C-alpha cells in the first residue's frame, strides 16, 4: 500500500525532502502545509500535490493521510508533533525534536502512549560518510579517541542555508550542537558523561548567542570538541574530524576523506548518496515493517538531556 | 657591543634559533650546550661555536657570556632559567616557562629580584600573520568574537616536529595549550575569566594524555575553542581561525588567509618572515635598550595561572 504523507513547511529543507521522496516507490505527498497559501500552492503545483493548507490541523483532519513530515521552524516542532500523534499519524520531525527538554519529554511520552512511529531527523546518522565510519566501528576495526567539529554560518540575519530570509530565529544550541552531541555518543558507542559549554554575548536584534563552544566526554573516555558560530565569513556548514586508533577521517556532508585528503568512496554504503532520502527511507520502512526507526525519539532523547544540562550551565 | 650568547639544547629548535641568529648583527653564540659531547661538538663546528659543553654550568661560568637561550627539554626549563639569573645572565626560555606553577613563580620572583631580562618563547606573538591580526586590533578595525584552534601531531612515540626521536616526553597542556592560552588573551585584549578542559585516557607507555579539549572565555565575552592531539594522523602543527566582527582569518605559521582561503601578504609587517628570528631580535633589542621584552615572564605569567587552573580541573 502507498503511504500517504502530509509535508509541513515548504522551505529549503521541505523542498529537499520532496525531491528525495520523488525517488521512493510507494509514498505520495497528498497535502502541503505552509504559512502562505499562494506560495504553498506554487510548490504543490510544481510537485503535483493535491491538498494545500495554512493550518496543520487541516491535513490532520484528512483520514487518508498516514504520516507527517515536519520541516517547520523549530519553535513549532514539539506542539505539532504532539498534534500529529493525537490525530493517530506517524511523525518525522526535523532536528531539533524541541527547544525545551519538557516538550521533548512530552513528545516522547505521547509516542510511548500511542506506540506510533515518531522519528527525529538526525540526518548525520544517515549520511553515507558517517555510516561508513560507524560500520568500521561496529566491525571493531576503529575506535574514536577525539571528534573535532566546526558548525559555521555567516548569519547575522534570520536566513536559511540558501541565503534566503527566515520569518523565525534559529539557535546554536538546540539545532546545530544537537547534531554533534547525538552523533558523538552514537559513533563512540558510549554515553556522554561530561559536558561544558561557554557562549559569547547575546545579539541585540536576534536575541540569541552568535558564538558557542561545547566539550564532551564519553564514559569510555572519548572526547569531542565543538565550535559553533553565526559570525563565520567562510564556507558554511559542518566539518567533522574523527581521530581514532587506526586512522583519521574528515567528513564533509556525504563526502569522506582520510586525514591526508584522500577521498574515500562511500557510494557503495547505501542505496542513495542523499542522506535526506535515506532518512525518509528509514522512516517509511519503519512504518511498513512496524518497527522502530533508527533515530527514533527514544533513541535520540539523551541528546536533548545533555543539551538541557548545557543550557542550565549557560544560564 | 656584540652580545655574547650561550645556547642550550642543539635539538630541532636550537638549530632553528642558530639559523635565525646568523641574521642578527651584533650577536654571537660563543657556547653550545648538549647532552652528548660529540653531537654538540659537530653542531658547534657547523656553526663556528668555539666552546662546547655538556652542562649548562660550564657555559654560565664563562665571564664573557651575556645571555642564554634555553631550548632544552621542558622539564629543565624552570631550574635552568633560575640558574641563568643567579649567574647574572639574561635568559630566554622556550615555551613553556615551566610545567608547574610553583617553578614559574620561582622564575618570576628571581627575575624581579635581579631586574634581568627574562623572556619566554611565545613565538605566536612574533609570527607576522599574528602580528598583522594584532595590529588590526590595535587600530580598532577588528574585534575577536571566537578563536577556533587545532594543535595536532601524530606522536605515539617521544618525537620532535621533524620526526626524530626525543630522549624526553612531551605534554599537551603545559607545552602546547600554552601557545593558545597566551595568544587568546593577548589577541583578545582581555583577560581570560573562564576555562574548562576534558582529556582522554593516559597512555600506558608514555604516561601522558593523548587528547585534550580546552574552552576559554575572555572578560569581554570573546570565546576560544582548542582541540589538542598526539593521535592525529594528518598534517602536524597548529591551525588558527580568528572569527571577528569585520572578518575571518586563518593563521598557518607565518602565513595568513581570509575565511575564503585568499592568502594575505604579511611581508610588510616586520623586518623578517621568520618568527623565531623576530623573537630573538626582540630579546636582543630589550637587552640592548634596557627595557622589558614583548613576551616577558611578567606579560605571560597569567597564562601559566590559567594552565594551573585547568590541570586542577582535569584532576
Ligand atoms: N540537517 C538537517 O536535517 C536540517 C537542515 C536544515 C533545517 N533543519 C530544520 O528544518 C526546519 C526548517 O528549516 P528551513 O531552513 O527549511 O526553514 P525555512 O526555509 O526558513 O522555512 C521552513 C518553512 O516553514 C514555513 N512556515 C512558517 N510558518 C509556518 C506555519 N505556521 N505553518 C506551516 N509552515 C510554516 C516557512 O514559510 P515562510 O518562511 O514563507 O513563512 C518556510 O517556508 C528547522 O527547524 C530546522 O532546524 C534540519
Ligand atoms: N613554538 C616554539 O617556539 C617551540 C616549538 C617546539 C618546541 N619548543 C620547545 O623547545 C624545547 C626543545 O624542543 P625540541 O623539539 O627542539 O626538542 P628536541 O629536539 O627533543 O631536543 C632539544 C635538545 O636538547 C638536548 N638535551 C637533552 N638533555 C640535555 C642536557 N642535559 N643539556 C643540554 N641539552 C640537552 C637534546 O639532546 P638529546 O636528544 O641527545 O637528549 C636535544 O638535542 C622544548 O621544551 C619544546 O617544548 C618550542
Author numbering:
A (entry chain A), B (entry chain B): 3 to 317
From the paper:
The key enzyme in the microbial production of PDC is 4-carboxy-2-hydroxymuconate-6-semialdehyde (CHMS) dehydrogenase, which acts on the substrate CHMS. CHMS dehydrogenase, on the other hand, has only been characterized functionally from Sphingomonas SYK-6 (10) and Pseudomonas ochracea. By sequence analysis using Interpro, PmdC is classified under the Rossmann fold-NAD(P)+ binding oxidoreductase superfamily, sharing common structural characteristics with the Gfo/Idh/MocA oxidoreductase protein family.
Each asymmetric unit contained six copies of PmdC, existing as three dimers. The crystal structure revealed dimerization occurs at the interface between the C-terminal ß-sheets of each monomer. NADP is bound to PmdC within a tube-like cavity formed at the interface between the N-and C-terminal domains. Residues within this sequence participate in stabilization of the diphosphate backbone of NADP. This includes hydrogen bond and electrostatic interactions between the main-chain peptide backbone of Ala12, Gly13, and Ala14 with the diphosphate group of NADP. Structural data revealed density within this region that was best fit with a sulfate ion from within the crystallization solution. The His177A mutant exhibited a 98% loss of activity while the H178A and H181A mutants showed an 89% and 83% loss of activity respectively compared to WT PmdC.
